[PDB]
Design an enzyme around this catalytic site. Structure first.
Site, mmCIF file in Angstrom:
data_model
loop_
_atom_site.group_PDB
_atom_site.id
_atom_site.type_symbol
_atom_site.label_atom_id
_atom_site.label_comp_id
_atom_site.label_asym_id
_atom_site.label_seq_id
_atom_site.Cartn_x
_atom_site.Cartn_y
_atom_site.Cartn_z
ATOM 1 N N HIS B 53 0.846 -1.188 0.000
ATOM 2 C CA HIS B 53 0.000 0.000 0.000
ATOM 3 C C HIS B 53 0.885 1.243 0.000
ATOM 4 O O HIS B 53 1.941 1.244 0.630
ATOM 5 C CB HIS B 53 -0.908 0.082 1.235
ATOM 6 C CG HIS B 53 -1.802 -1.100 1.453
ATOM 7 N ND1 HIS B 53 -1.393 -2.219 2.134
ATOM 8 C CD2 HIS B 53 -3.119 -1.306 1.169
ATOM 9 C CE1 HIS B 53 -2.384 -3.089 2.204
ATOM 10 N NE2 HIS B 53 -3.458 -2.570 1.605
ATOM 11 N N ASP B 56 2.246 2.038 3.431
ATOM 12 C CA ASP B 56 3.221 1.099 3.982
ATOM 13 C C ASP B 56 4.651 1.526 3.656
ATOM 14 O O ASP B 56 5.597 1.251 4.407
ATOM 15 C CB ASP B 56 3.065 -0.304 3.380
ATOM 16 C CG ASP B 56 1.752 -1.028 3.650
ATOM 17 O OD1 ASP B 56 1.151 -0.790 4.727
ATOM 18 O OD2 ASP B 56 1.354 -1.859 2.775
ATOM 19 N N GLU B 180 -10.533 -6.685 -5.193
ATOM 20 C CA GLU B 180 -10.415 -7.685 -4.137
ATOM 21 C C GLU B 180 -11.702 -7.725 -3.314
ATOM 22 O O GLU B 180 -11.973 -6.817 -2.524
ATOM 23 C CB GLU B 180 -9.198 -7.416 -3.252
ATOM 24 C CG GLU B 180 -9.033 -8.426 -2.133
ATOM 25 C CD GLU B 180 -7.704 -8.429 -1.406
ATOM 26 O OE1 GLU B 180 -6.766 -7.750 -1.868
ATOM 27 O OE2 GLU B 180 -7.600 -9.124 -0.375
ATOM 28 N N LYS B 182 -14.397 -8.871 -0.322
ATOM 29 C CA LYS B 182 -14.487 -9.355 1.054
ATOM 30 C C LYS B 182 -15.925 -9.156 1.532
ATOM 31 O O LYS B 182 -16.513 -8.127 1.180
ATOM 32 C CB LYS B 182 -13.532 -8.570 1.954
ATOM 33 C CG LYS B 182 -13.342 -9.152 3.351
ATOM 34 C CD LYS B 182 -12.405 -8.333 4.231
ATOM 35 C CE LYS B 182 -12.097 -9.021 5.547
ATOM 36 N NZ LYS B 182 -11.243 -8.189 6.433
ATOM 37 N N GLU B 216 -9.180 -13.595 -2.427
ATOM 38 C CA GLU B 216 -8.403 -14.021 -1.263
ATOM 39 C C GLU B 216 -9.056 -15.259 -0.634
ATOM 40 O O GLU B 216 -10.252 -15.268 -0.359
ATOM 41 C CB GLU B 216 -8.269 -12.889 -0.229
ATOM 42 C CG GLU B 216 -7.479 -13.294 1.018
ATOM 43 C CD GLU B 216 -7.307 -12.235 2.090
ATOM 44 O OE1 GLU B 216 -6.924 -11.114 1.742
ATOM 45 O OE2 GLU B 216 -7.610 -12.524 3.272
ATOM 46 N N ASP B 244 -4.647 -13.746 -3.683
ATOM 47 C CA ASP B 244 -4.140 -13.696 -2.314
ATOM 48 C C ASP B 244 -4.346 -15.058 -1.644
ATOM 49 O O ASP B 244 -5.464 -15.550 -1.518
ATOM 50 C CB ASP B 244 -4.826 -12.642 -1.426
ATOM 51 C CG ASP B 244 -4.427 -11.178 -1.583
ATOM 52 O OD1 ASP B 244 -3.568 -10.852 -2.370
ATOM 53 O OD2 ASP B 244 -4.972 -10.354 -0.823
ATOM 54 N N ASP B 254 -11.627 -12.194 9.958
ATOM 55 C CA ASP B 254 -10.596 -12.458 8.975
ATOM 56 C C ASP B 254 -9.289 -12.803 9.693
ATOM 57 O O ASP B 254 -8.626 -11.932 10.265
ATOM 58 C CB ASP B 254 -10.462 -11.241 8.068
ATOM 59 C CG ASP B 254 -9.500 -11.313 6.902
ATOM 60 O OD1 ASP B 254 -9.435 -12.353 6.236
ATOM 61 O OD2 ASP B 254 -8.906 -10.266 6.591
#
Ligand code: MN
Ligand code: MN
Ligand code: MN
Ligand code: MN
Ligand code: MN
Ligand code: MN
Ligand code: MN
Ligand code: MN
Lengths: 387, 387, 387, 387
Positions: B53, B56, B180, B182, B216, B244, B254
């Site tokens: 990211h 990061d 992605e 979730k 993921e 992922d 998670d």
């Protein structure tokens, strides 16, 4: 008060009120119903119509004279009551031949049989006036990873749906298809397990305009998903052709409780969305009167499905119409959500210092969303506890 | 034995090994890692590359001289090690400004900021050589039904992704996008909750060819779905741009366990599918070394991700190559699944008496699928218990 | 209307309204609250009292002069408002020393520290007038099977609780203990995961009379269990010492929504049970105002907890008092459920031909339970849609 | 290699291999088996014995001459093979009379019938040599909150179990009872839903020594619980009288997969625990050969249950015996977990400055638990990937 009328477009499957009560661990608790009796009793409750699997209306393996007679008697009951048949479907799940699927059975001869069985029933559905033909691939899937190559199964599923689209086009029929997702049960994992997976699949068909979804409340909830959110995506895509209404208490076996039971608040937000969006299709109930019930209880449970829809319709409309709620929606910036992010275009956004270089991140972060006040007004409306 | 090499294309997020251990109920258990140290240690373990990211790599709110220095040091570490950066992403979830979303925030100014923050990082990702740009809309969603009009939110989500596609086209960049999914966490329900919902959404974008999925393992499992099945649908659609890898023990928070942990058999069937399909992208791990661990444990957990992939790759290949398994696959009619249902066409199928009028349903139903024998051969291969 | 008063015994944890909004994926969205401010604002809303972890009231690692001052200021706020402190607890989960547990840490020195930390806070809880001391073993458990021998961990858990019972007896304290179950989060699996497991464990303690349960709505729902059923078993055992009220949308991360949110019908049946049973303890809320909210939203969410309890209390009482509901309860044989099965004794039952040899199984099976009618009357009462 | 022998104590229910394949959505796929054939085929596979519900062995509503003949033929098959009958149970769930329960039916006459039906079968179980009598209250519970007063139902459940204990004592029988929990299915919520709830309930019976648990792998997993943890609590209590082994893929309908399928790693940790603890009872399989299978597949699936237990037994023993694993267990302080927290007593702990005043919290927190290394050694052993 909350009295249903045919105008409200409430429909029921023959297999709902006609469920004999056999479960994994128990024998039937009720005798079979004649479809004629079901049509008559549902009309008396204020229903608009009824739906059927082929094998609900005509016992599997009926002769040509038997089939004709079963349909004739049913058509007379519809004519006697003014009831409609807006949707029909095929049973590709009860008979042991379908133990590994219909359209995606590993055995090619079974796949071909499944298509012929479906086509025969499409003709009957059109004769009875149905606008939508549902497919629930309940046997399509696996208990184990090696049993089913899922890419090959999706190729076979596409081939089947493409042939059905070719057939309806060839006959000049007005009927359209609706795929009904479910994540599991009776297979360990079912193909096309959610509304999203079904919508994605449709985009790969030869004639995507002929196909939509038939989402079921309890099915999306068996994956712990938000049913209103999934319905919103279906509406966004232009693919909400039909819907199945019922209740479910979270992640477990498919309960098929009466509508309103299970997740009550999710039922509220669903009715709010259907009404706001102007959904015009049937309000169809796919539910099982619990096997604890006698025939009087069957009709009470059916009546409760319709009553709960009408209570929630009243409460959702009152919520949206309340000036205090309208103010709270502006306080929460629902108005701003509906405005384009960058109508000015990409270049203008890149050149806007207010969007990055000179954006006060801290002041924006400090602004509360006021969602808790909004949600408590929604609770107060649902419960009739306003003032 | 099971020793990883850069050829195996194993990658790790900086935020994985660099996770300090802060959870809902606990403080950090490990000091922050310098990204330079992570690149060096992962290279020593046999990794191919690393992902990031924005925040990061460059602490949020760094000046222009600070940003330059953080990137310079990181680029030197990549050059020193031969490590690659195949994928990057934007943090649209940590800062309190994003409490109601980035691309779908109710506040328009936040949506515009989210796009500018993303665009700045796309430029950096291209400079570092990334082929894929991931978007995880972790804050897109709601805790309550009134907070978020989902049709309006999907309009805003489409507008955002369309602008990003316009941007990359305008700059002549080769980079592609991967959404992605979730289902929940940190929002009560997240928009685009599964692989299916993300695939369906992409079909509504202006330039669908530029967008795929980054599924993921643990995310699909948080909805109780079959991860291998979802990957198969993504592959069928031509949209598996990235993946992922991790572990998850069913339907809960998670967990982001190391790959191989959680559902071991699902990990086996996943590796079998990726290898059979010829997936050529990064084998990326999005995992958290448990906060019980010190720095030695962090590197042991990272090494275990790669080791478990390589063990499972060996066992899946042995399964597929075994003559006894090949015989069992024919006994189970996996060969017949891969043959067209009606290559002869619709008319021929309708005129085929063997598909309906003269089909022996009872004889077909009596034929066992032989799936249990097949699955026990798969178990025996996974466990190294053949003969 | 639905205005709370101290008489209603509503209590809140300092950590509830004081939650800064840090989640797994995000930074704080609100400043820390002074406990003095929380006590004052909650009193203004009509609360009865407040509860605390040690480290909520006194920052971890405060000196003796600091501790004294924090307690003095808090006691003055209680005295200024008339607010009570009915319950307190220990934080054995935030500090990294507790990463593998407190009472069941593998490290013996940590287990001893956890007991000393707890004992110090029991003394303070008694000074502030608490009747119940809660233990939530949030760090007791594992992510992996080898990390924790569960028989040994239960031996250590029993040893800890037995020492605490010895301590309170030695000091002549009136305080009693309440164990708070949770199935998972922050550990992969937590020891004593449900109300049942905690009740069973208590029966093995040296002085079982000193220990009960503190069940939390959302915790039992994270295992897909029926919270009202679990509360009924706790009441049956004489062990409902305290309760935590909140909301949860099925099987996922611990949401801690305001009470009434989540499973609305389960909240109704819970209030019905607490009131019918004459539960006399605190109605304590363990909830998190969503991080989307500012301080005004925090107090609105707290107020909503109390309001929803009072609405549901009214509706449950109206249900039970309705003559039509009383008739429906007799139709469903709830009266017969409350009569002994064989007050006549074992021999008489064996000699009763009417119970076997001459029992008409078919006539009994044909009798409907009338549960659907009963449940729709319950729905009508909850929604204020009676007549 | 992994060949079962009667010494291994593997047992199977008649209803397992004899399952005809009827599910909620499908007809039988296999003919009924004669119990005599099942006993013979299971003996040939290396089983130790078989178990039965009353109605599996004697068709419901058999006359006295019919019952005698069914038992005589079965006893001859046991004598011909050397097979044992270690456990039996009552079917209190199939017949429509039990639609609202047996022991906790609202109708008193049904409760009395349920007890008489159970007592008749206890006599038969003793005649056939059973040591354990299982009770699965599959119909005890509700779909709705008003249908069942759970305190009254628990009173009736206790009364029933107390009468059964009086009966066995009066007859001088050696048989003991084992309660089998399940959270849901076929009722919306079942009473005594987990191992913990059943253990807690037993402590309230008049003669608690006569009662234990029969936990089933898939049942605890239907609540998302850790099955090995629950077994450890049962062992800790001295109440693991019997066990049901199978597989389950997370939170959904009760799948009853062959043992080893489903959660493979949980199966490993279970076998490790049973073997470490010296569990001496039957290794009983309660599984369903999927309805996709023919009779050859039924026997292959049964054989696979036993094979997978024996593979996992080998791998768990190798794990525990490995010097490198023994070192890792010490590194993770499993040795310290097994040492008393305060053998020195409460006063000594209070006076120990090293436990609080002079405890270095920071140094303790910095010590890694080394659990990831330990767990990867466990993975390596399970997969046969050691070195
Ligand atoms: Mn259904
Ligand atoms: Mn349906
Ligand atoms: Mn994740
Ligand atoms: Mn990720
Ligand atoms: Mn909580
Ligand atoms: Mn709590
Ligand atoms: Mn079972
Ligand atoms: Mn069982």
């Amino acid at each position: 008060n909350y009295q249903p009328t045919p105008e409200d477009r409430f429909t029921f499957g023959l297999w709902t009120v006609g469920w004999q009560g056999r479960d994994p661990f128990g024998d039937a608790t009720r005798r079979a119903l004649d479809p004629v009796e079901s049509v008559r009793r549902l009309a008396e409750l204020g229903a608009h119509g009824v739906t059927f699997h082929d094998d609900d209306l005509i016992p599997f393996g009926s002769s040509d004279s038997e089939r004709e007679e079963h349909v004739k008697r049913f058509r007379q009951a519809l004519d006697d009551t003014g009831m409609k048949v807006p949707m029909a479907t095929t049973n590709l799940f009860t008979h042991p031949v379908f133990k590994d699927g219909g359209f995606t059975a590993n055995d090619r001869d079974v796949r071909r049989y499944a298509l012929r069985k479906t086509i025969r029933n499409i003709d009957l559905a059109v004769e009875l006036g149905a606008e939508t033909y549902v497919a629930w691939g309940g046997r399509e899937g696996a208990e184990s990873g090696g049993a089913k190559d899922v890419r090959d199964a999706l190729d076979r599923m596409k081939e089947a749906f493409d042939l059905l689209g070719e057939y309806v086009t060839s006959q000049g029929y007005d009927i359209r298809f609706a795929i009904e997702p479910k994540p599991n049960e009776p297979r360990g994992d079912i193909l096309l397990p959610t509304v999203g997976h079904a919508l994605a699949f449709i985009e790969r068909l030869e004639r995507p305009e002929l196909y939509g979804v038939n989402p079921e409340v309890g099915h999306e909830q068996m994956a712990g998903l938000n049913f209103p959110h999934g319905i919103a995506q279906a509406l966004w895509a232009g693919k909400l052709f039909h819907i199945d209404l019922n209740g479910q208490n979270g992640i477990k076996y498919d309960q098929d409780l009466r509508f309103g039971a299970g997740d009550l608040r999710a039922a509220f937000w669903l009715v709010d969305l259907l009404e706001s969006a102007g959904y015009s299709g049937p309000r169809h109930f796919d539910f099982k009167p619990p096997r604890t019930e006698d025939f009087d209880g069957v009709w009470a449970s059916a009546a409760g499905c319709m009553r709960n829809y009408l209570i929630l319709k009243e409460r959702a409309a009152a919520f949206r119409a309340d000036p205090e709620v309208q103010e709270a929606l502006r306080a929460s910036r629902l108005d701003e959500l509906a405005r384009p992010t960058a109508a000015d275009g990409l270049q203008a956004l890149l050149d806007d210092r207010s969007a990055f270089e000179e954006f006060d991140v801290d002041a924006a972060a400090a602004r509360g969303m006021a969602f808790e006040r909004l949600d408590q007004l929604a609770m107060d409306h649902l419960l009739g506890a306003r003032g």
